[PDB]
Design a protein around this nucleic acid. Structure first.
Lengths: 405, 550
RNA sequence: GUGGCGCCCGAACAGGGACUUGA
């Protein structure tokens, strides 16, 4: 019955020779406790060290559960085999769901565990669990079947998913559906209670084929940017004017309609940073021009899909965060805000990445204001999703922090 | 050997190499030929002369324990060609992770690599030729091999896994070629299970003694000595040389860092800044009084003996720090007071400019990494720092810095920012517009400041770019200023330096900056751009531009 | 003669911040 597709990397693309960062025993116990069962059900298989390729492992305990599940950091594998899901078996991206009231993310990782896989491709998906204190070498394994965290297995699973979803959505037309990764989306601009009813009906319909499926709920259409607004204190100190003047000079690159002539007129008279300086009619006219501008968005940018996304992020204080997105610099697409520190950060990247999923159908490249060892060590505990973004680290300038207060 | 032998191929589209034999002696020749006969009649090696035109060279030796001309080989022309394997045996087992187990033992292996065969599609590539002359090819795992330890450990684990599942109560740690085995059981049953293990392995053709070092320990293990309930380094001394060389320096540095992991209270920093610029291997450098006072400290520490401990999984463990100053940090780990598991050293410089709390975060996260890789659980903490400081730091900082559960200790010294900054200027304070520049060709920079009163200033400098020019400019400003102050500059460098709030740094001028900044009770800082005509900023930039910007 | 781990010291690539030649 099974007839897997011949799959292969781009020529001139080695496999993932990657290490495995440290782990804890509390996770290792559960990892063994579940991989043994995965191995008994014919899903995976032991090997020797004859193959060098590796791929990391890390545990989770996600929201709406208390188990000890797992997932894999397949970042290199996807980056190197992206041709497969880009041309061989690809799918289009709609743009209707983001204007709808409500959605509901699903998780269908179990169905992937009922289909075999190419034998020539299994050595590119070795995953090692370590042993503490380098006592024993790694208990290596190999994936026999289509694994989670990889963006080629839903690509080929969409064919039988189409025959799965055939009956109901001809009945239920007004719903939009996506399938990016192990997770699944459902567009429903209708009543949220009826949304839940149809979600339960769909869950039962998946159970009909023996599919077990036990943030979670989202409302995208109300999202907007934070238009940069400025104070209106009739009094002004020279500190305020200098701060505003540097703000606008750095913002000039974004908004070409930016003028600071009258504000620079007030500074030829040197004085302290506490006197009052009445803004003339001309200077307040310039303010009003700027404030009428910033209520509007940019005019001249567009979503280039073939490029990559860069989702920068900043910290402000008070437990209040920001985020900025761009393909090319100084051409923004979406900004915003979002209210312990590291937990806020993983929540924020989860939120932003889901937003990117629903809007553009792609995961961005991050630039975080934090060290490498800290995140690499601690991020594994508080994560709750089932996918991975691409990230790096940055040495943040204290002027982009002046984006918002 | 009915073992589950492994398939092994060669790299994509390549061949086995061909080399010439070396010019060697006559005495070793018949001796190593007899060695070859011994290994052959031991059931290891296949002799094939006219098989194929491959010739892997030989590098024999008169190794340690003279007259024992052991068999040797080179494989540098093939190890680059052999297909990669995986290696997770990267680090080493730390003594701490070794658990408190009463009935301990050990079983080494003799000629381990020479007991596993190799796959007949690969025995061709083992051309061991020697002077007519004659060729001899392995059927086994030889040395000089890239994938021999991995195959060795894999087959060993898969062999002893039934033994593991039969007695999971018993612990088995392995290494390159050695077996640290132990339990908390009684000796009549210990040796019984060990003899059953011996017969279990000799079912697969493996060596093991009974007259080994079981009560003969402590062992010697990568420089470590292991008592049953205690442990320590291989015993250490230090040279009494009246002078010092750089080889002598690096020797003792490696020695004490190999001893720092158990010995609390060590200093190396001033004893290692000497190497910067020290690059020749004969330079007789002095024993400068900083280093003299340091190594006297160190020898006082070492003159007393000490021993470590092992780990009990039940009793939760504790970390602690006894800071000893000068950007250096030590750390103790103990499950009970005065019984230290291990210690060490951390004085790295993440950026030449830094503060103390940054270094502390660095240290605790590195200690968490090591405690994870050793035991598998991050520890509870006990740190010399108040909560309000941590709260002020991570609220007024442009990054995220977390630490696990912790608490306060009243162990002097303390950690505290020697100053701070305000987010709001002052009425009655002074304004200071400053700037300063220099040349790429003469380096004869100029710097100064100006107020709103008029008490301006100009200062020339030398041998620098504009960054240190601005820094000396704010220095001269603070020296010419008073008690509180409000300052404005035109550089993001000085702001990025100051607002990190460092208390110690390398070059002397930022040290002077902070030294006189602590005196001024209050201070504001801001930033503005250039080439816009912003008040005094243009004036000063004009005034210092004379003779600089032409 | 070779390889591996550690400590120290030096050369190439990306990002950021600053100074010179042209419409």
């Amino acid at each position: 019955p099974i007839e897997t597709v011949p799959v292969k990397l781009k020529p001139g693309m080695d496999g993932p020779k990657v290490k495995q960062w440290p782990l804890t025993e509390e996770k290792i116990k559960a990892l063994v406790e579940i991989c043994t069962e995965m191995e008994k059900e014919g899903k995976i298989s032991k090997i020797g060290p004859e193959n060098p390729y590796n791929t990391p492992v890390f545990a989770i305990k996600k929201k709406d559960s208390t188990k000890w599940r797992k997932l894999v950091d397949f970042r290199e594998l996807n980056k190197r085999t992206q041709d497969f899901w880009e041309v061989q078996l690809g799918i289009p991206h709609p743009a209707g769901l983001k204007k709808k009231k409500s959605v509901t993310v699903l998780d269908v990782g179990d169905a992937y565990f009922s289909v075999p896989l190419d034998e020539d491709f299994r050595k590119y998906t070795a995953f090692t669990i370590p042993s503490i204190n380098n006592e024993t070498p790694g208990i290596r394994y190999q994936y026999n079947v289509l694994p989670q965290g990889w963006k080629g297995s839903p690509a080929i699973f969409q064919s039988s998913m189409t025959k799965i979803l055939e009956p109901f959505k001809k009945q239920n037309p007004d719903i939009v559906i996506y399938q990016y990764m192990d997770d699944l989306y459902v567009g429903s601009d209708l009543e949220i209670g009826q949304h839940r009813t149809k979600i339960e009906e769909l869950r039962q319909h998946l159970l009909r084929w023996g599919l077990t499926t036990p943030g979670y709920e989202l409302h995208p259409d109300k999202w907007t940017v934070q238009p940069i607004v400025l104070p209106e204190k009739d009094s002004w100190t020279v500190n305020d004017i200098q701060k505003l003047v540097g703000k606008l000079n750095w913002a000039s690159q974004i908004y070409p309609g930016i003028k600071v002539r009258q504000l620079s007129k007030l500074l030829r008279g040197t004085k302290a940073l506490t006197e009052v300086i009445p803004l003339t009619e001309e200077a307040e006219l310039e303010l009003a021009e700027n404030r009428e501008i910033l209520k509007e968005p940019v005019h001249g940018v567009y979503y280039d899909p073939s490029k990559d996304l860069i989702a920068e992020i900043q910290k402000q204080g008070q437990g209040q965060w920001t985020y900025q997105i761009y393909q090319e610099p100084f051409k923004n697409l979406k900004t915003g805000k979002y209210a312990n520190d590291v937990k806020q950060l993983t929540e924020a990247v989860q939120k932003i990445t889901t937003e990117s999923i629903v809007i553009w159908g792609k995961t961005p490249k991050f630039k975080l204001p934090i060290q490498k060892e800290t995140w690499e060590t601690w991020w594994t505990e508080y994560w709750q999703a089932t996918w991975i973004p691409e990230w790096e680290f940055v040495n943040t300038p204290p002027l982009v922090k002046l984006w918002y207060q | 050997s009915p073992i589950e032998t492994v398939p092994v191929k060669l790299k994509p589209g390549m061949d086995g190499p061909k080399v010439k034999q070396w010019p060697l002696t006559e005495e070793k020749i018949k001796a190593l030929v007899e060695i070859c006969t011994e290994m052959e009649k031991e059931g290891k090696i296949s002799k094939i002369g006219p098989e194929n035109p491959y010739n892997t060279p030989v590098f024999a030796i008169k190794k340690k324990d003279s007259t024992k001309w052991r068999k040797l080989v080179d494989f540098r022309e093939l190890n680059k060609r052999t297909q990669d394997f995986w290696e997770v045996q990267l680090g080493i087992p730390h003594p701490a992770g070794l658990k408190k187990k009463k009935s301990v033992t050990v079983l080494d292996v003799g000629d381990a690599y020479f007991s596993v065969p190799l796959d007949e599609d690969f025995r061709k590539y083992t051309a061991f030729t020697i002077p007519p002359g004659i060729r001899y090819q392995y059927n086994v795992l030889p040395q000089g091999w890239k994938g021999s330890p991995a195959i060795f450990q894999s087959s060993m684990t898969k062999i002893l896994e039934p033994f593991k599942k039969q007695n999971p109560d018993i612990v088995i740690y392995q290494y390159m070629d050695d077996l640290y085995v132990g339990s908390d059981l009684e000796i009549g049953q210990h040796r019984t299970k060990i003899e059953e293990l011996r017969q279990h392995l000799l079912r697969w053709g493996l060596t093991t003694p009974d007259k080994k070092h079981q009560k003969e320990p402590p062992f010697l293990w990568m420089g470590y000595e292991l008592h049953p309930d205690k442990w320590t380094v291989q015993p250490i001394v230090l040279p009494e040389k009246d002078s010092w060389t750089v080889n002598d320096i690096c020797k003792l540095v490696g020695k004490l860092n190999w001893a720092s992991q158990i010995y609390p209270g060590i200093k190396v920093r001033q004893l290692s800044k000497l190497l910067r610029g020290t690059k020749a291997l004969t330079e007789v450098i002095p024993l400068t009084e900083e280093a003299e006072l340091e190594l006297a400290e160190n020898r006082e520490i070492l003159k007393e003996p000490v021993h470590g401990v092992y780990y009990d999984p039940s009793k939760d463990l504790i970390a602690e720090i006894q800071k000893q100053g000068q950007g250096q940090w030590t750390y103790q780990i103990y499950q009970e007071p005065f019984k230290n598991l291990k210690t060490g050293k951390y004085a790295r410089m993440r950026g030449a400019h830094t503060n103390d709390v940054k270094q502390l975060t660095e240290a605790v996260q590195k200690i968490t990494t090591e405690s994870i890789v050793i035991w598998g659980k991050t520890p509870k903490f006990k740190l010399p720092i108040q909560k309000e400081t941590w709260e002020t730091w991570w609220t007024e900082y442009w990054q995220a810095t977390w630490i696990p559960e912790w608490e306060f200790v009243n162990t002097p010294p303390l950690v505290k920012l020697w100053y701070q900054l305000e987010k709001e200027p002052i009425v009655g304070a002074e304004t200071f517009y400053v700037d300063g520049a220099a040349n790429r060709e003469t380096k004869l920079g100029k710097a100064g400041y100006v107020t709103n009163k008029g008490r301006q200033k100009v200062v020339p400098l030398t041998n620098t770019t504009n960054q240190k020019t601005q820094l000396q400019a704010i220095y001269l400003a603070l020296q010419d200023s008073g008690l509180e102050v409000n300052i404005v500059t035109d550089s993001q460098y000085a702001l990025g330096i100051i607002q990190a709030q460092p208390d110690k740094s390398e070059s002397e001028l930022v040290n002077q900056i902070i030294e006189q900044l602590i005196k001024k009770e209050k201070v504001y800082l801001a930033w503005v751009p250039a080439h816009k005509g912003i008040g005094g900023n243009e004036q000063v930039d004009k005034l210092v531009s004379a003779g600089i910007r032409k």
